[PDB]
């Protein structure tokens, strides 16, 4: 949004609140105290407010919000009910929008009266307002005609003489009930209503010309409607409808969803004579909401069409015949786009999910809620997909043409998702896709046809000035081949140079951390997953590979990270290897101050072993055992400290041999955001990290106890031999890494599968650029332990594949972060996420984890 800061991520420190605030006049014997940046509480002084009473939630629209607030304040000041309301316009938009949860909607004014002075204040409020219709909150029933809603909610925290405080537990009797925020008005158990309110709870009204809809499913309850099917009583075709509750759903401008669906109705009413043309089967307003049902055609969205029809592997694409399909569907897109540009109707939102394709490659356009019926203004693109946002308030027809250009460049090369970050990013895809379509062996006529199409779509795009504060980021146009080692050093000095640039950009805007992090790990500041010193460590190792440093800021940062990386042990409580307590000690070990690192390792060793509730390589005792094993191989500690480590490691594997499941839990096979019960493949979050532990343990010591558990761990990882997850951390490339590490140890039956998963991991495309869940983790493991000098071939593979993810800044390059947009540098996806691969591919060390 507008308050969302560019370049890097931001959790919450730019609540700027540059808008008109909400406040009311304060009389004597009253107060206005600031609550948590959203409410202002006003209470009379010396008046005993009680707990556990009947609240009233008053809701209103955007236009009459100030007038209704002034009316409720002026009717509530002369009498003795406490009163609170929202702070500013931006928080009012946030509480009445499309992304906010449906349980908290319309929370504008919550007064807190008493039991005795209740009927009087409700009748006074009803007669006082008597107008200003607004949203219906999904908590209560609408008392009278004014938007007055009585919820038996939560009051002030419990007094010192009272007991059982229990916030949001409502304390009915001795027992307390969880105040669930269900959309249906449900009275909690017990609690006798008052006599004047008992006649309000039973005002049931009769039936009428009831809707002929049979609602079967519900997928997408955002705030007001849903992407959900239904059944029609008369027409046998499937129907999907939208729900428009009045006065809810908003952008930064005062546009409700009712007129958005009205615009969709007035668009698809004249879009009825076309081949796809989802016509309005029924339009009307029932009770107070507005419904709109449209026909659904059979097909798949373009995400599934791209991920099912693209030459990822050499065996999935047989007899080619893919660029002909691309040319056909882009030609259909161009013809149908020029079709509706005559009657002055446009889309203004071109998304992958808005383009539906079916058998014989027939396109279909849906989701016309943001249509426009006039092309003579220069409005800015308000709502857009992550990768399909226009720039500099350009013309709506060419906003649609920009969306068509971006979706065609996605079809040529699927990397649209960072085009909101770097302007004209599609030149990267246009340059890069030709060099691999000439490598797969596609026909020159088809390649020249699709390149001529992409050049034709560039003629209708508004090439304009770049004023969006992201003038730092530009695309490359000097993507050349790699034929010498001098190419490698003058590339890698550019990659070195590009880091202090974004470091200065980050420090000139934030002061909390030192390096930017991805959202998933913005709060994390430890380990070798999301921290502030692992990236600088990779920077130091990769700068050691170049004959000159040319670093402006490298000494005070080095002397500062040691000072700021020692107080986290008394603050943080997350252990393990990645984002753990011992990962920072491991980082300090390859940093300098070896005596300080050994002292920290000898100090914090026993307290971090029993504090792990899991046994994974990410957060578990395996990482502490790995770092202790590495320290035993290095010889930095004594035998008195090193004796019990092997004994505690044997207890980790004797139960593992007898019980191989233990903490394996359910058989999940997805990752997504990598929190909820991961795919447990490979390293890190995977189940195969114990194989890496057993390999590094049998590298140092030797017996038959560790080898059997090693082979059992390889067989336990081997049950997934079947997919679309070849990645390094959570994927199948970790198994290739383990087998390449222990080729002399494992038998020829186990080495027989080495030639099998190589064709599985030889994909020509991955979405993310990182090494955990990106492309670089595959290529760093493809030649990790080849025992041969093909390092230059490995660089000439990896960098030429990595040219598609680069954005140029000064004379340097930098990596787009997770999910494409919102650039960062970490081990997951960043400068370090290629820097570790670069320093590992030409040294065969893989500095993430040692080789004993």
């Amino acid at each position: 949004f507008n308050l969302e800061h560019p370049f890097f991520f931001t959790n919450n420190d730019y609540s700027t609140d540059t808008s008109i605030k909400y406040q009311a006049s304060l009389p004597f014997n009253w107060h206005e105290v600031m609550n948590n940046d959203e409410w202002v509480y006003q209470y009379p002084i010396g008046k005993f407010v009680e707990r556990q009473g009947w609240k009233i939630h008053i809701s209103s629209e955007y236009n009459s919000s100030h007038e209704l607030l002034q009316d409720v304040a002026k009717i509530c000041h002369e009498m003795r009910i406490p009163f609170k309301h929202l702070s500013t316009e931006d928080k009012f938009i946030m509480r009445n929008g499309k992304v906010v949860s449906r349980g908290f909607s319309g929370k504008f004014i919550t007064c807190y009266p008493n039991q005795n002075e209740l009927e009087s204040v409700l009748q006074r409020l009803e007669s006082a307002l008597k107008q200003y219709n607004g949203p219906y909150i999904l908590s209560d029933k609408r008392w009278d005609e004014a938007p007055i809603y009585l919820r038996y909610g939560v009051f002030r925290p419990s007094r010192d003489d009272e007991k059982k405080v229990a916030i949001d537990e409502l304390i009915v009797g001795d027992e307390v009930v969880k105040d669930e925020r269900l959309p249906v008005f449900k009275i909690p158990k017990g609690i006798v209503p008052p006599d004047f309110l008992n006649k309000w709870l039973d005002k049931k009204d009769k039936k009428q010309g009831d809707f002929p809809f049979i609602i079967d499913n519900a997928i997408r309850f955002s705030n007001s409607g849903g992407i959900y099917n239904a059944r029609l009583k008369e027409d046998g075709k499937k129907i999907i409808l939208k729900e428009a509750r009045p006065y809810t759903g908003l952008g930064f401008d005062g546009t409700y969803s009712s007129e958005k669906l009205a615009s969709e109705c007035k668009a698809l009413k004249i879009l009825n004579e076309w081949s796809e043309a989802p016509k309005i089967y029924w339009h009307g307003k029932i009770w107070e909401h507005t419904f709109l049902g449209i026909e659904h055609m059979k097909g798949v969205p373009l995400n599934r069409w791209v991920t099912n029809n693209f030459p990822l592997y050499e065996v999935v694409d047989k007899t080619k015949d893919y660029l002909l399909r691309v040319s056909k569907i882009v030609e259909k897109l161009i013809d149908l786009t020029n079709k509706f540009h005559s009657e002055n109707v446009y889309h203004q939102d071109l998304h992958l999910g808005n383009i539906l394709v079916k058998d014989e490659d027939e396109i279909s356009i849906i989701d016309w809620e943001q249509a426009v019926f006039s092309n003579d203004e220069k409005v800015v693109h308000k709502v857009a997909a992550p990768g399909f946002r226009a720039w500099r308030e350009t013309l709506p027809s060419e906003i649609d043409w920009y969306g068509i250009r971006q979706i065609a460049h996605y079809l040529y090369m699927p990397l649209v998702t960072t085009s909101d970050l770097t302007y004209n990013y599609v030149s990267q895809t246009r340059i890069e896709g030709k060099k691999l379509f000439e490598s797969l062996g596609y026909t020159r006529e088809h390649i020249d046809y699709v390149e001529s199409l992409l050049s034709y779509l560039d003629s209708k795009c508004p090439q304009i000035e770049n004023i969006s504060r992201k003038k730092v980021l530009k695309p490359m146009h000097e993507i050349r081949t790699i034929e010498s080692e001098q190419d490698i050093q003058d590339f890698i000095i550019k990659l070195l140079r590009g880091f202090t640039l974004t470091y200065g950009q980050w420090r000139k805007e934030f002061q909390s951390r030192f390096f930017p992090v991805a959202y998933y790990g913005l709060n994390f500041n430890q380990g070798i997953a999301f921290s502030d010193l692992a990236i600088l460590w990779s920077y130091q190792q990769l700068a050691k590979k170049v004959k000159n440093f040319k670093f402006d800021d490298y000494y005070e940062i080095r002397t500062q990270v040691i000072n700021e990386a020692v107080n986290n042990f008394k603050k943080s409580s997350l252990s393990g290897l990645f984002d753990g307590k011992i990962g920072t000690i491991w980082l300090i070990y390859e940093f300098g101050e070896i005596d300080r690192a050994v002292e920290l390792f000898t100090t914090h060793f026993i307290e971090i072993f029993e504090n792990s509730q899991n046994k994974n390589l990410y957060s578990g005792q395996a990482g502490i055992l790995l770092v202790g094993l590495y320290f035993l191989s290095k010889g930095e500690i004594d035998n008195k400290l090193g004796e019990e480590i092997l004994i505690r490691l044997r207890e980790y594997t004797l139960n593992y041999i007898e019980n191989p499941e233990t903490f394996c839990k359910v058989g999940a096979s997805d990752v997504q955001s990598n929190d909820p019960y991961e795919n447990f493949g490979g390293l890190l979050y995977g189940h195969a990290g114990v194989a890496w532990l057993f390999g590094e343990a049998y590298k140092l010591t030797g017996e038959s106890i560790y080898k059997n558990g090693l082979e059992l761990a390889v067989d336990k990882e081997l049950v997934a031999y079947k997919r679309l997850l070849p990645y390094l951390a959570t994927g199948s490339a970790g198994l290739l890494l383990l087998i390449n590490r222990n080729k002399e140890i494992l038998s020829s039956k186990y080495l027989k599968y080495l030639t099998s998963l190589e064709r599985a991991t030889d994909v020509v495309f991955c979405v993310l650029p990182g090494l955990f869940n990106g492309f670089c983790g595959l290529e760093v493991a493809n030649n990790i332990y080849s025992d041969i000098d093909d390092n230059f071939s490995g660089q000439k593979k990896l960098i030429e594949q990595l040219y598609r993810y680069l954005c140029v800044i000064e004379e340097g390059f930098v990596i787009a972060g997770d999910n494409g947009l919102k650039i960062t540098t970490d081990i997951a996806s960043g400068f370090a996420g290629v820097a570790i691969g670069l320093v590992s591919i030409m040294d065969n060390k893989l500095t993430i984890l040692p080789q004993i």
């Binding site: 009204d205 009428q208 309850f221």
Partner: peptide, 17 residues
Amino acid sequence: VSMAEEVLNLQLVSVQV
């Protein structure tokens, strides 16, 4: 019009295909 069925059908939650 004249019905409260809209608020009391607005949560069912089913299917994930």
